[PDB]
């Protein structure tokens, strides 16, 4: 076996070709950014939501 | 702690929430805390729960 998978058909893990080792792969950091207005006619100012 | 009555804790206790309710991932699913197969491998594909 070369490759893992998933649910998704998405690879969770692979072995390295030369060190024969088992890496997981996991997506880096993603999500939504909502921003909080207050409205423009009162002021300019917004706060982010991560 | 939570301030419910007796009959509320049991109802509280009886639904399970299928592990639904988690939204943040990171620090490995929250240290299993969110249900990881579940939860991290829905929300891998950008589906979240607010």
Known sequence: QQFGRDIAD???????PQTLEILDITPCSFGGVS???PGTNTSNQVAVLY | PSKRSPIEDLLFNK???ADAGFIKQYGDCLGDIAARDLICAQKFNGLTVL
Do not use: C, E, P, W
Request: charged content about 25%.
């Open chain 1, 35 to 37: 921003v909080i207005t």
């Open chain 1, 10 to 16: 998405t690879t969770d893990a692979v072995r390295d």
């Open chain 2, 15 to 17: 639904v399970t929430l």
